[PDB]
Amino acid sequence: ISHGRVFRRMGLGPESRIHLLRNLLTGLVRHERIEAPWARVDEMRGYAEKLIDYGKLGDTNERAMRMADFWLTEKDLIPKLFQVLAPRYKDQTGGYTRMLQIPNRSLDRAKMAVIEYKGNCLPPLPLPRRDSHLTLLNQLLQGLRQDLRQSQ
C-alpha cells in the first residue's frame, strides 16, 4: 500500500537514490540536456525547480551556498548557476524545465525522456506544435466567437 506517496526508488536505498539524482542534476546543469528514463528525468526536474528557486533567492546566503556545494560535485558549476541561470529567470517564477518524451532505447527498450531548461543556446527540440488557426474547426470557432462578441 502506497497511497499518496511518491519517491520512486531507484538504487539500493535512499542514499543511492539521492546520489543518482545529484549526479543527474549535475549533468543537467553542465550539459543542459540528458536522456534518461521518465522517472529519473521527472525527479531531476522536480529537484532542479527547487535548485533554481534557491539559486534565485540569493547568493550571499549560507544555506543556498551549502545546498549548491552539496548538490554540485564539480564546484565550477556553482558560479555558473549563480551568475547565469539565476539572472536569466529573474522574470519567471516556476515556469521552466520543459519535459519531452522520446520513444525507446536501442538496448533494453525502456521508456525514456529528455528535459532541458528554457532559452538554451542549443537548438530547440521539435516541439509538438498544435494545429494552425486556419483549419475548418478553428475557423468555425473563430466565427462563433466573433458572432457572440458582436451579439453581446
Binding site: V84, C121, P123
Partner: protein, 108 residues
C-alpha cells in the same frame, strides 16, 4: 509439484492464441508535418531528434575544443553561429562559438 498427465495441443492453442496474450493493434501512428519518417502521438519524431542530437554533439565538440581542458564552466552565456552572420550588439558578453556550415532552416 509434478503433473499426473500431459497437456494437449488444444489446451496449448487455447492458452497461447487467446486475445489476451496477442499483441494489440495501436491506432496512434500518424505522419509528421516536417521531414516525415513515421512518428507517433505524444512521441517526438526520431528524424528531427537525431538531427538535433547530432547538432548538439557538434556544438559540444566545438565547445570542448575551445575550452581545452576540463573543469572550466564559464560564468557567461553562450551563443552559436554559422557561416558569416556578424555578431549582434546584444551579444557582446556572450561566448561566440562559430561553426563551419550554413545555418539550417529549423534553427532561428
Amino acid at each position: 509439484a509434478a503433473p499426473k498427465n500431459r497437456r494437449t495441443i488444444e489446451v496449448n492453442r487455447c492458452r497461447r492464441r487467446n486475445p489476451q496474450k496477442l499483441i494489440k493493434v495501436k491506432n496512434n501512428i500518424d505522419v509528421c508535418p516536417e521531414c516525415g519518417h513515421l512518428k507517433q502521438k505524444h512521441v517526438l519524431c526520431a528524424y528531427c531528434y537525431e538531427k538535433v542530437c547530432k547538432e548538439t554533439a557538434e556544438i559540444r565538440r566545438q565547445i570542448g575544443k575551445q575550452e581545452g581542458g576540463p573543469f572550466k564552466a564559464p560564468t557567461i552565456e553562450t551563443v552559436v553561429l554559422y557561416t558569416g552572420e556578424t555578431p549582434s550588439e546584444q551579444d557582446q558578453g556572450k561566448r561566440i562559438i562559430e561553426r563551419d556550415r550554413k545555418r539550417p532552416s529549423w534553427f532561428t
